[PDB]
Amino acid sequence: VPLDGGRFATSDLNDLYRRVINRNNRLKRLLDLAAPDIIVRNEKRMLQEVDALLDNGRRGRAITGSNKRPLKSLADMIKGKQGRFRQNLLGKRVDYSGRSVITVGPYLRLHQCGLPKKMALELFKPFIYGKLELRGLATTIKAAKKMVEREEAVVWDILDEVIREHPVLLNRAPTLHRLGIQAFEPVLIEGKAIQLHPLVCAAYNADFDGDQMAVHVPLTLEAQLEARALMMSTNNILSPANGEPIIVPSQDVVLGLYYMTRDCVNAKGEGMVLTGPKEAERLYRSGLASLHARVKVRITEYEKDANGELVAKTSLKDTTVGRAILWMIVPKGLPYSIVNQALGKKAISKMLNTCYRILGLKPTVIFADQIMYTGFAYAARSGASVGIDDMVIPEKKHEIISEAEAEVAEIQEQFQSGLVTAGERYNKVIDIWAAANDRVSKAMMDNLQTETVINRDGQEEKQVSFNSIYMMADSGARGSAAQIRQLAGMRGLMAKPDGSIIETPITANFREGLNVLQYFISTHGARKGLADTALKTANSGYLTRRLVDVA
């Protein structure tokens, strides 16, 4: 191929064939001349080194190019991850595609994804050409091309027509399991970023810190019918690994629901009687009564005890205002006890699973959308911040540290007098620091989870707390009881690179801050964890490749 500016690019096979034809011609000329047998034997060995053309670098060493690199023969054009098989015949590059950053956009229904107008204008170019030519708004196709180049105002309604019931495909780069590619209807966006529904970020394993996704377009009728029947988002709500749903509300919505369904022991308007959940809504938004206050309401729950026929049952349940507000979301066939609790994350996943197994699929998908909407709304209405006063340090911590220091001093004196062994003092120190860490964790949790003390019409009472970090941990909304105690209690005992455990653990928390030595000890564990999470990916991908090629 002629490069611009009088340069020439060729493959190495031209050089290899040049070599073989040259040596063959030379041998022809030698056989004309009746050369000495040493000469013709040397020439035949040179002609044998055919071997380079077929598979260079197998026998002996590989002849190299002008850049002194082993050039590529035919077997290197077939084999390898750069050969035809893995790189060009199994995975191709495709027309009608594009990519961008992703953003949240919670106003979507879950069967539709946001998409910028410019990406729609680029991907659906020939559909637009055909539609414009059919409507008689451009005489030819050339005029249609120049019309969409000028972005004249009638092209957008044509784009809206051809975008109507036309699915697209969304995909993120580590496509581990079959939920990696899903279909979506588009809704056009006056931006530049793909808006993707928040409930499926768990399935995509996508977080919005700059992750990118690629769009694909199905062209033919069979492909669009496949995208609507199989790969549509509302048809993949259960994991193929196990029957648990994959549309679990993830972190914010579950916090909102957890805050919505609890019970302060004495809030505004406790002990009144409500005549239906609509009255609970009115009593809340007018502000006359709190979101959580124990209130006797009347509700009606429908049960399908008959042969697939709902049967009404109405009574006087004893619940809170927030729960009775949430009850206007649940469809007909579910018993009331599904929303009569604190509504954590396992609880809401089980609620969705029960709705799926009792009602069907359509009410469950509508229930999922309504759940996400109300979760976001009351999470924002909570005002759940996180402040430096929301990390309570238990006041017995330094005393526990002092007593553990006394114990380690005693064991140090015992080994100084030689009464014990080195491994003995090692395990004595390691066990007393383990015991002290456990006791300080107990103290922190018992001072954090339940210290709230409020007074209903009398002396005093203790309840579970609204100390926002405790909500973010107990609700299941992305917080673990093992990632607290690194904010209040001691940070445990870190490990040296050998795999042993340091004798003196880091006894400082992120509220009080570490000093230089403790931080430098803590650095190694983070670096080792980062390296392992970097190098586990290759082994996992290799294992998946082996398994999908054996089955």
Partner 1 sequence: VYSYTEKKRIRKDFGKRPQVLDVPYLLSIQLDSFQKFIEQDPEGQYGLEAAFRSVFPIQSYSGNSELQYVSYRLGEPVFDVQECQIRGVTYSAPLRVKLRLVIYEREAPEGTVKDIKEQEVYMGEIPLMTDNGTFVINGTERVIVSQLHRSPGVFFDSDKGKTHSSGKVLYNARIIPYRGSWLDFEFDPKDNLFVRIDRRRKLPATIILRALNYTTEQILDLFFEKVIFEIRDNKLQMELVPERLRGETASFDIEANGKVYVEKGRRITARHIRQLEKDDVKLIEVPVEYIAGKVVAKDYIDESTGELICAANMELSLDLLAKLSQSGHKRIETLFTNDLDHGPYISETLRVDPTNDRLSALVEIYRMMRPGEPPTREAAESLFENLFFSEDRYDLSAVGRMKFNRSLLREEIEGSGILSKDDIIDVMKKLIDIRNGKGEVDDIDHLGNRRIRSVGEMAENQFRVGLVRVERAVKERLSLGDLDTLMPQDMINAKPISAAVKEFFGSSQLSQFMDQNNPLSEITHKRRISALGPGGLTRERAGFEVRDVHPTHYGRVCPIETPEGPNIGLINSLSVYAQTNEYGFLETPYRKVTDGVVTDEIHYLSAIEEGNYVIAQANSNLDEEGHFVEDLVTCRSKGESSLFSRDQVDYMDVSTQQVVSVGASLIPFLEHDDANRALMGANMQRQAVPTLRADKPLVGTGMERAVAVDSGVTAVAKRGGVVQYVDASRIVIKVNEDEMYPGEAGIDIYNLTKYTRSNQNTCINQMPCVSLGEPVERGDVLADGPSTDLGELALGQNMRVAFMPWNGYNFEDSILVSERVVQEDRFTTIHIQELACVSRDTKLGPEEITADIPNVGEAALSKLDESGIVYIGAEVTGGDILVGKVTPKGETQLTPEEKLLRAIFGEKASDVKDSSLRVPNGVSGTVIDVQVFTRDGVEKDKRALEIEEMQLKQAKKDLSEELQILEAGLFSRIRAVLVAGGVEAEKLDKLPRDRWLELGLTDEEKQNQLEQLAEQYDELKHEFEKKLEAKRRKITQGDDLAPGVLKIVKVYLAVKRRIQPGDKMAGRHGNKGVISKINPIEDMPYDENGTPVDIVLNPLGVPSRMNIGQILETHLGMAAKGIGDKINAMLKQQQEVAKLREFIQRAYDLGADVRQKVDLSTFSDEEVMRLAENLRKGMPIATPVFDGAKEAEIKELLKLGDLPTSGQIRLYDGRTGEQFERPVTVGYMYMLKLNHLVDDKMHARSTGSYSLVTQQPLGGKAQFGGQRFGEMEVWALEAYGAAYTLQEMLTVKSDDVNGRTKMYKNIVDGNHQMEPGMPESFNVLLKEIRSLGINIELED
Partner 2 sequence: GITKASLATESFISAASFQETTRVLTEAAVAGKRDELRGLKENVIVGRLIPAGTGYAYHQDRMRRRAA
Q: How far apart are CA 504 and CA 517, in angstroms?
A: 11
Q: Encode 44-61: b = buried (16+ Cβ within 10 Å), e = exposed.
A: eebbeeebbbeebbeeee
- 79 interface partner picked from partner 2, partner 1, Mg ion, none, CB below 5 to 8 A per type: partner 2
Q: Is 438 in the site for partner 1 (CB under 8 A)?
A: no
Of 209 and 549, CB closest to Mg ion: 209
Provide, rounded to whole angstroms, the least separation between the CB of residue 83 and partner 2.
7
How many alpha carbons lie under 13 Å from residue 239 in its C-beta half-sphere?
16
Q: Nearest 5 degrees, angle CA 254-CA 259-CA 261?
A: 95
The count of residues in the chain is: 551
Task: From 293-301, 335-343, 448-456, 529-537, give the range in contact with partner 1 by CB under 8 A.
Answer: 529-537
Contact (Cβ atoms closer than 8 angstroms) between residue 202 and residue 349: no
And the tokens for 348? 């809401």
Contact (Cβ atoms closer than 8 angstroms) between residue 336 and residue 320: no
Of these, 209, 222, 318, 549, which contacts Mg ion (CB under 5 A)?
Answer: 209
Of 210 and 458, CB closest to partner 1: 210
Of these, 44, 69, 192, 296, which contacts partner 1 (CB under 8 A)?
Answer: 192
Q: Is 522 in the site for partner 1 (CB under 8 A)?
A: yes
- 497 interface partner picked from Mg ion, partner 1, partner 2, none, CB below 5 to 8 A per type: partner 1
Of these, 71, 110, 119, 293, which contacts partner 1 (CB under 8 A)?
Answer: 119
Of 33 and 547, CB closest to partner 2: 547
Map tokens 């005693």 to a residue: 410
Of 70 and 106, CB closest to partner 2: 70
Q: Is 469 in the site for partner 1 (CB under 8 A)?
A: yes
Of these, 59, 69, 313, 381, which contacts partner 1 (CB under 8 A)?
Answer: 381
Of 222 and 498, CB closest to partner 2: 222
Q: Is 95 in the site for partner 1 (CB under 8 A)?
A: yes
Beta-carbon neighbour count of residue 214 at 10 Å?
16
Rg (CA), the chain: 35
Q: How far apart are the first and last CA of the chain?
A: 43
Q: Is 542 in the site for partner 1 (CB under 8 A)?
A: no
Q: Nearest 5 degrees, angle CA 92-CA 214-CA 549?
A: 45
Judged by CB under 8 A, the chain residues 498 through 517 that form the site for partner 1 are: 504, 510-511, 513-517
- 477 interface partner picked from Mg ion, partner 1, partner 2, none, CB below 5 to 8 A per type: partner 1
Q: Encode 430-458: b = buried (16+ Cβ within 10 Å), e = exposed.
A: bebbeebbebbbebbbebbbeebeeeeee
Judged by CB under 8 A, the chain residues 252 through 271 that form the site for partner 1 are: 252-253, 255-256
- 546 interface partner picked from partner 2, partner 1, Mg ion, none, CB below 5 to 8 A per type: partner 2
Q: Is 472 in the site for partner 1 (CB under 8 A)?
A: yes
Classify 210 as helix, strand or coil: coil
Provide, rounded to whole angstroms, the least separation between the CB of residue 72 and partner 1.
12
Classify 92 as helix, strand or coil: coil
Q: Torsions phi, psi of 52, nearest 5?
A: -70, -40
Provide, rounded to whole angstroms, the least separation between the CB of residue 390 and Mg ion.
27
Q: Is 103 in the site for partner 1 (CB under 8 A)?
A: yes
Q: How far apart are CA 203 and CA 191, in angstroms?
A: 25
Cβ-based neighbours of 548, under 8 Å, separated by 6 or more: none
The residues binding partner 2 (CB under 8 A) are: 55, 75, 78-79, 83, 85-86, 89-90, 222, 226, 545-547, 549-550
Q: How far apart are CA 49 and CA 68, in angstroms?
A: 18
Provide, rounded to whole angstroms, the least separation between the CB of residue 231 and Mg ion.
23
Contact (Cβ atoms closer than 8 angstroms) between residue 408 and residue 429: yes
Provide, rounded to whole angstroms, the least separation between the CB of residue 32 and partner 1.
28
Q: Is 207 in the site for partner 1 (CB under 8 A)?
A: yes
Of 49 and 303, CB closest to partner 1: 49
Map tokens 């729609």 to a residue: 120
Q: Is 207 in the site for Mg ion (CB under 5 A)?
A: yes
Task: From 145-153, 211-219, 491-499, 535-543, give the range in contact with Mg ion by CB under 5 A.
Answer: 211-219
- 208 interface partner picked from partner 2, Mg ion, partner 1, none, CB below 5 to 8 A per type: partner 1
Provide, rounded to whole angstroms, the least separation between the CB of residue 333 and partner 1.
28
Provide, rounded to whole angstroms, the least separation between the CB of residue 205 and partner 1.
11
- 214 interface partner picked from partner 1, partner 2, Mg ion, none, CB below 5 to 8 A per type: partner 1
Tell me the number of residues near partner 1 by CB under 8 A.
Answer: 140
Classify 307 as helix, strand or coil: coil
Of 338 and 445, CB closest to partner 1: 445
Of 341 and 504, CB closest to partner 1: 504
For every residue of 359-422, DSSP letters joined together read H-SHHHHHHHHHHHHHHHHHHHHH-----GGGSPPPTTHHHHHHHHHHHHHHHHHHHHTTSS-H
* Contacting positions for Mg ion (CB under 5 A): 207, 209, 211
